[model samples]
Target chain A: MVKIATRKYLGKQNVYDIGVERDHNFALKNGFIASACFAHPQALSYETEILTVEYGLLPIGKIVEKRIECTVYSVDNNGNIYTQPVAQWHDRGEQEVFEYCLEDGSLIRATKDHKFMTVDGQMLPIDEIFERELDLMRVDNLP
Target chain B: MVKIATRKYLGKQNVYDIGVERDHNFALKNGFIASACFAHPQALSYETEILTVEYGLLPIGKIVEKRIECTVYSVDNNGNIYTQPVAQWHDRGEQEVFEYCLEDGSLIRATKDHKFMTVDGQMLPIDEIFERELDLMRVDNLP
Candidate 1:
């Protein structure tokens, strides 16, 4: 793995982690691989369309309909941007979600307990991150 | 997709493509997205372990056993190295395969008709590429 040269922690409302059916690990542009081994990784409101392919951006809600067999944009622990193909589309049913509006006018709507990779290279639940006023790792350019 | 900045064609023996249940496209290192819609994409010898993750490299033949739900190293169309998570793995029963020994002493064993992404940004059967003496896009650092 390459060393992250620039870990640009975007203080935006995006927080991510995936429930890949296989490898259980995801690469970040910041050069680190986070594990979803312990808890469910980042979960977003079904309406988020941050996942992208060359054709256009993908809506997380419609990943099932789009059936994205290609890779989508992601960020590494080094705060660098890259791409990672999605594994499984998750429908967490429903939860009491919170929204984070950031300087970029972006928003994150996820379960309060949905965890994410923090800017400092760690995992934290969304509610905790909000209280701490910390940022989450970005994929392409979302939480 | 980023335009290929430096399309280095490696005359090696590896070829790849996947039978993804969705999307029907694969990204290449030469700034192009290839449609695996019409035909099955690239395939390699069952023993090839070309897929990789941060902890170490992965063996393609064992992707099923490893249950790789995470992203693995891949290359992009800009002639840049990147990563793409694998989709569903295929066990194509049995087929006649050919092996090519390249300058780098690497080998490839695939069906003659297994198509691949060429350095020139198009798809051709492995045998055709071989007959034409064309190189395939290297993923991470394979064919």
Candidate 2:
């Protein structure tokens, strides 16, 4: 299991933010009082007015820590997310890598080496690939 | 428009066959008289008894050609296919490359160079990448 830190806003509306490093697993969790927010850093300013509000006597960077055993899928610039039974791959000793189709028409893969590379053998910076947050869903039976 | 060759059996049951090179666009056609059969070479022996039946007064390898203007998708070993509004990408001057997740837990790209490459920068053989056919569907509204 891995421990990750996430932030929640306690302003006009309750919002949770998962940093780009671990935003891939946004769809798996649910909360009755508040749902997980998959907001892009750029869109957060436009979506909510919490950045301007003060949190009474507390600070705004309310961080929470959680432990997770599984990783989730990531999205590309075009907002297309890829999902598979990733845990099964690990259980079966398969060397699985994640891939995405970019809006520029290039195919990129999140290699086992922990870097993204284009089809033409170009290495893309991590910030360039995960600049925005994308919604992901579990595709259980992918026949 | 492009011309493609397909085959149909005349004996026992009515069956249509689409070769591996262009099996991606199988859903656009219809007919009880012209069903789509994306059979692998190994399955052909069991699906059609053509080797046992005679071509009668006609010679074998009788080819029928059809003209189509749209593009088709490609499949990987695990039977997972990816489709996008590729026509739209072309219209917007986007360079789109097809991708597949191989059964071995690796992600590969069908590069514009007409070759396959692994995410970690290894060139793979065409026969190894396309060893089996995958099912495809139309995903028209891709961002």
Candidate 3:
């Protein structure tokens, strides 16, 4: 089971940094776009892989917030594009995460600092799950 | 007066055709992005100096209901480009309108159609006023 890392922020107010980890060989030619994970308050595992990066306001109001949605197309794995089926979602609390299959491509939860586990085991926090999803999405969006 | 003409559609519906008789020469080009104008309840006179061919949209029931906002960067005159300002807004109406404007621009309106008027003349219809307001908004979006 491959493990993926994640990050969290207060909201759109903070700038989040992302790149290839030491073990990974991912590099962004232009700077990377911010990705967000939606989650619930109590932290039960829902769907992972819902992420977004905003650009600016649409109409200018609290109820009316607008920004461009960011998507990662592709990433380099050991220096190759990892192609497979991946599913992600954001829960009630605004946390986003990713869920995918293991080495053999069977469904499992990848989170920060935890070994990949099946749905019945201890639940992973939303942030950890998001980092894993981001790497995979970035690889998917790469040219 | 540069006259410029354009068309607008609301939501997925067609509203009215509009034109502007401008006081100055304005222009638009082949690839310029123009902003959209939404009508408030109050307007006076609206006219279009230049005219363009009408375009079609999808069927009525299949109308896609989504917010639209835009900014005008250039105007087309004899296929020439002119720089202008950009306006942004959220449009909710289904029926859209095509507007025309004059080069020097003249959105002429009066209480009476008579050359010589009485002391107290009847005002134009409310719909006409709304049309006039919509025309000005079209001009404002011009950079």
TM-scores, one per candidate:
0.36, 0.19, 0.18
lDDT of 1 at A114: 53
lDDT of 2 at A70: 33
For each candidate in the order shown, give its overall lDDT on alpha carbons: 0.47, 0.23, 0.24
Docking class of 2: incorrect
Clashes of 3: 85
Q: Which stretches of candidate 3 lie over 4 Å from their true place?
A: A1-7, A10-136, A140-143, B1-143
Kindly list the per-residue Cα lDDT of model 3 for residues A48-132, writing each as its tens digit.
2222223221111111122222333222222344322112222223333234333333232222222222122212343445454
Candidates in descending TM-score order: 1, 2, 3
For candidate 2, chain B by itself scores a TM value of 0.19
Better of 1 and 2 by lDDT: 1
Using DockQ as the yardstick, the better of models 2 and 3 is 2
Candidate 3 local lDDT, B37-124, one digit each (tens) = 1122111122211222221212111221221121123333233344332222122233323233323343322111101101122122
- Model 1, span A1-143: residue lDDT tens: 12112222233343333444333335332222334322322455555554445545455566644555656554443555556666655455544556655444555566555555666655556566667767665443433
Candidate 2 per-residue C-alpha lDDT over B1-143 given as tens digits, one digit per residue, 9 for 90 to 100 = 11112212223322123322221121121100111111111011112211111221111112111211223333332334433211211111122233334343322222212222222222223233354232122222221
